[PDB]
């Protein structure tokens, strides 16, 4: 039966998919030929193909907008129609749209080109990478770190402020014109589900859930913060108050997004040897071939398919040398038409082993939803791909797997102290980033909502810094600065809450798959290898793509319609008890009023 509108939309979607497959394949092939062999011919071909693809997409969008959505009763065609009908930027007038593109490119350029020069030696000038990152990573000098921090900020943020002001105003005009409340509501729209009874999800439910879960995360972070504060007091005597917040420029990176680089300064038991299996790999004369063969064997051992011969034939797995310069950022390419490759300049290190496992998890995700229609070939939401890669890397990092594969000696004794070392190193990275992410996105949401006037942007930014993250600026900043925009994601128009959601999802998935694998010991020692049941349970979710709602896909694996924090707390329980014992005679919490200046 059905209406006459539906059938027309069905025929249109068939024609659109069949026309778009080839254009997307050509554009992706062109971008691959560029990224592995940087020449001018290749960049010109890349830009030509990209402009052709964008023109085709805009033509098909303007055509598809003529089918009235309300009369469609088939959910798949409804999703594809909604995806195609997104106006995007087109609802803006021409002159302001040109100005918006101009300001976007200007911010990106000024970020990617800014240099700060040392006043002591005005001939020496450094950009952010690699100079400022190396200094902020390895320097132990308080004054030098403070100089780097203040020079970078007082240089780039002062320039960035007005561009960001106009960016905010234009983006809010655009978002309101496309029938949204603001640009933050637009961003939160990614999680909306509307139409399936019992699985719906509004855009404010996301805020509610994020706040409810950070409330439960708070105590573990408080204890970790107290421990790190004590260790830093031991590291910089007479500079840190035993009751105050941590100075922002002593956290291990340019912003404090990760406390990873404090492990050398905070290791609980430095007497034990570290489980670095790099030397064993090097002494057995392993190469990239062997590494990827082992990753493939791992993925096949749980019931997932092999890689295609095309992958092994077309991928570039080693540095082509000095004659041919390429981009070495590890990437997983879905070229279309069943062509899958990986571009990564692998070194013979344990980190590259783990990242090979991660990227091959990405590739397996991409392979699993290949039979879906074009516009449905994507993760359930923005957090699923990274969660899958991360659970792969977690399973691969367990010492049991390293022993069973033969790179670690069979007589390696697993004391209770190596486990605490491992859990602390994991916590510095995984839980240290959650308050930062939550606070950054809260500030962005509030700015877009118009709750923070322009004349107190930095005031509210540093108030939130103090209250939530427990971090205080080393020198006072007036409203001329724009310190939030000194981060890449802020100045390049990328959403940020995806990392919070993925951090929760990855431990939900780990709990589900280890319960399925009949694991009995502590969760952090779980290795899902040789569990075809877990493989099947994961594939049942992988195969859906974006055809079904993300709530149903998450329930299919974990049994819950919403994000949960108890998996993370169960992962960190031993470290939690160890900190609770270790902090018996320490102050837990912080006063929001002490400052490194007066």
């Amino acid at each position, epitope marked *: *039966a*059905q*209406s*006459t509108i539906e*059938e*027309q939309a069905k*025929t*249109f979607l*068939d*024609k659109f998919n069949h026309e778009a497959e080839d254009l997307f394949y050509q554009s992706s092939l062109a971008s691959w030929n560029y990224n592995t062999n940087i020449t001018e011919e290749n960049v010109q071909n890349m830009n030509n193909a990209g402009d052709k693809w964008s023109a085709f997409l805009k033509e098909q969008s303007t055509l598809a907008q*003529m089918y009235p959505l309300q*009369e469609i009763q088939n959910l798949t065609v409804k999703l594809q129609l909604q995806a195609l009908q997104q106006n995007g930027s087109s609802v803006l007038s021409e002159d302001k749209s040109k100005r918006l593109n101009t300001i976007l490119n200007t911010m990106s350029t000024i970020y990617s080109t800014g240099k700060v020069c040392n006043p002591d030696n005005p001939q020496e000038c450094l950009l952010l990478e690699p100079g400022l990152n190396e200094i902020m990573a390895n320097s132990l000098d308080y004054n030098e770190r403070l100089w780097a921090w203040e020079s970078w900020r007082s240089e780039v943020g002062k320039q960035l402020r007005p561009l960001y002001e106009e960016y905010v105003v234009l983006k809010n005009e655009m978002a309101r014109a496309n029938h949204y409340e603001d640009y933050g509501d637009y961003w939160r729209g990614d999680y909306e589900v509307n139409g399936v009874d019992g699985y719906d999800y509004s855009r404010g439910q996301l805020i509610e859930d994020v706040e409810h879960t950070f409330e439960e995360i708070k105590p573990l972070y408080e204890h970790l913060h107290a421990y790190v504060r004590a260790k830093l007091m031991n590291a910089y005597p007479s500079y840190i108050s035993p009751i105050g917040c941590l100075p922002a420029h002593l956290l291990g990176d340019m912003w404090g997004r990760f406390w990873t680089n404090l492990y050398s300064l905070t290791v609980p038991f430095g007497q034990k040897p570290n489980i670095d299996v790099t030397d064993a790999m090097v002494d057995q004369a392993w190469d990239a071939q062997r590494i990827f063969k082992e990753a493939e064997k791992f993925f096949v051992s749980v019931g997932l398919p092999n890689m295609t011969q095309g992958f092994w034939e077309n991928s570039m797995l080693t540095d082509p040398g000095n004659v041919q310069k390429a981009v070495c950022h590890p990437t997983a390419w879905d070229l279309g038409k069943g062509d899958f490759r990986i571009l990564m300049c692998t070194k013979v290190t344990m980190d590259d082993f783990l990242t090979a496992h991660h990227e091959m998890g990405h590739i397996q995700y991409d392979m699993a939803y290949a039979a879906q229609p074009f516009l449905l070939r994507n993760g359930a939401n923005e957090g699923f791909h990274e969660a899958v890669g991360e659970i792969m890397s977690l399973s691969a990092a367990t010492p049991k797997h390293l022993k069973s594969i033969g790179l670690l000696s069979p007589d390696f004794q697993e004391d209770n102290e190596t486990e605490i070392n491992f859990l602390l190193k994991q916590a510095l990275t995984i839980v240290g980033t959650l308050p930062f992410t939550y606070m950054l996105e809260k500030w962005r949401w509030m700015v877009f909502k118009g709750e923070i006037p322009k004349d107190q942007w930095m005031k509210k930014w540093w108030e939130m810094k103090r209250e939530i993250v427990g971090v205080v600026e080393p020198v006072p900043h007036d409203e001329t600065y724009c310190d939030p925009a000194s981060l890449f994601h802020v100045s390049n128009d990328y959403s940020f809450i995806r990392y919070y959601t993925r951090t929760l999802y990855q431990f939900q998935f780990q709990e589900a798959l280890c319960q399925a694998a009949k694991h009995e010991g502590p969760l952090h020692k779980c290795d899902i290898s040789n569990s075809t049941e877990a493989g099947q349970k994961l594939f049942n979710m992988l195969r859906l793509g974006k055809s079904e709602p993300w709530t149903l896909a998450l329930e299919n694996v974990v049994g819950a319609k919403n994000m949960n924090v108890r998996p993370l707390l169960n992962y960190f329980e031993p470290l939690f008890t160890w900190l609770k014992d270790q902090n018996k005679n320490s102050f837990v919490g912080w006063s929001t009023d002490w400052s490194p200046y007066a």
Partner: antibody, heavy 121, light 108 residues
Framework: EVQLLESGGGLVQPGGSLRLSCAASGFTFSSYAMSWVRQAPGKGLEWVSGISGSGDRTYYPDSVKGRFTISRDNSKNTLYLQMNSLRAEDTAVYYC??????????????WGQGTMVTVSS | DIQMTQSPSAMSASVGDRVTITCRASQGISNYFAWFQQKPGKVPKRLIYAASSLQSGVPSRFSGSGSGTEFTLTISNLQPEDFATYYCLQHSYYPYTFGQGTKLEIKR
């Protein structure tokens, strides 16, 4: 110009079979849905059957469901209607009409002359 | 199944009279509507195709109106060659259904 033509009308026994053909010319046959419309003698009209563009989804009405089968060969620009288990009530003139395209709300506009299908013992 | 009840069934009028034929749908059928004329022994010829859009080559005395659930065909001034049978047809939802027809006769 579009000049739909029909053939295949004759006399058949009750319970017999018959295959109607409708030859299309003058337009891009492969991009238009086609339909069959009959007229009982001295009565109104009814929608016998309908097909989609790429000869895939075929729709039917409760009266002649499961007895009739519509089909097309886009190569020969020919539309077919296969009718089995005919009964005395199927006596009617049958037309083949053009139908919707892919975007507009246009509908039946070019019809053939018809062919007379009498079912009697 | 949308069920179409046409009123009236028959109708007689003189040349010049204003004639109005109605076709009612039991539910909403959007703007997918069409009116067909049939002379005896000839093929139905389309007059209006989007409930209100006149067909090329059809005199302007024919006009169509209405939407939603109620629809009306109207002839502004009758003509000798206007004596025929008129059918309404909806093609929105499957299956499709015609009206019972309306025969417009001469008054003597």
């Amino acid at each position: 110009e579009v000049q739909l033509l029909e053939s295949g009308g004759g006399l058949v026994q009750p319970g017999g079979s018959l295959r109607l053909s409708c030859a299309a010319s003058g337009f891009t046959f492969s991009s238009y849905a086609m339909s069959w419309v009959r007229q009982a003698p001295g009565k109104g009209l009814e929608w016998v059957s309908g097909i989609s563009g790429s000869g895939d989804r075929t729709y039917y009405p409760d009266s002649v469901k499961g007895r009739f089968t519509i089909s097309r060969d886009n190569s020969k620009n020919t539309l077919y209607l296969q009718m089995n288990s005919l009964r005395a009530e199927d006596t009617a003139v049958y037309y083949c009409a053009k139908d919707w395209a892919m975007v507009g709300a246009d509908a039946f506009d070019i019809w053939g002359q018809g062919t007379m299908v009498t079912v009697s013992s | 199944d949308i069920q179409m009840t046409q009123s009236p069934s028959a109708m007689s009028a003189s040349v010049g009279d204003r004639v109005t034929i109605t076709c009612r749908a039991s539910q909403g059928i959007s703007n997918y509507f069409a009116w067909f004329q049939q002379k005896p022994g000839k093929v139905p010829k389309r007059l209006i195709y989007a409930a209100s859009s006149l067909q090329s080559g059809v005199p302007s005395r024919f006009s169509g109106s209405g939407s939603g659930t109620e629809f009306t065909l109207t002839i502004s001034n009758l003509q000798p060659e206007d004596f025929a049978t008129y059918y309404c047809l909806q093609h929105s939802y499957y299956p499709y259904t015609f009206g019972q027809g309306t025969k417009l006769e001469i008054k003597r």
